[PDB]
């Protein structure tokens, strides 16, 4: 449950299925990005169409995400990593998430930045 | 693996400075959330400031909630840390993702929740 929630979400949001992607949230579900900034479920749509875009823009340049190994905890946070090398592999940027899980929704995506 | 990330943190909280520097590689790495990388050489010091910080938090009531700590099918050890003032008031959030190799600690990447 706990990973197919998060697992379905990316695939969705992969295959810009917006609706889907919306739907593994709560109503008070949130996403806190690197910096700390909360967006609630009234912000969240709007801003994951922001980062579909942004992901649009690294396959256009050749900038290349290499995502790896999505694992749940005894508790049922699940992780994943990403990795952001340009296009010669120099690594630009690493990316973690934590997703709290509750109710079998997205209570809180939690995003963690390598500056 | 995770046995690694075990004992490190056991004897880090131990102040056995000594098999806390053992489960690290010679080409092992620290990098914080901000990005700078710590070599071999600067581990040992770095990680002696690191306990210093955990003491000033339990004489000061703050107190760190640990969480989880668990290994991806590739061999990556995460675990994460919660640090709430006294009330519990979450002042920050931390985690930890463990790149290990040959039974060996290769990377300590910190990510900070700023």
Same mark, same amino acid.
């Given at each position: 449950m706990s990973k197919e929630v998060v697992s379905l979400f990316f695939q969705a949001s992969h295959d810009n299925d917006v609706e889907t992607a919306m739907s593994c949230?709560? $109503? +008070?579900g949130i996403w806190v990005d690197p910096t700390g900034k909360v967006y609630e479920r009234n912000e969240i749509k709007e801003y994951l169409v922001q980062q579909i875009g942004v992901l649009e823009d690294f396959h256009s340049q050749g900038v290349s995400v290499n995502y790896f190994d999505m694992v749940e905890a005894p508790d049922g946070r699940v992780y994943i990593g990403a990795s952001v090398k340009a296009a +010669?592999?120099? $690594?630009?940027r690493r990316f973690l998430d934590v997703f709290e899980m509750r109710d079998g929704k997205i209570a809180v995506k939690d995003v963690f930045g390598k500056q």
């Open positions: 949230f709560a $109503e +008070d +010669d592999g120099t $690594e630009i």
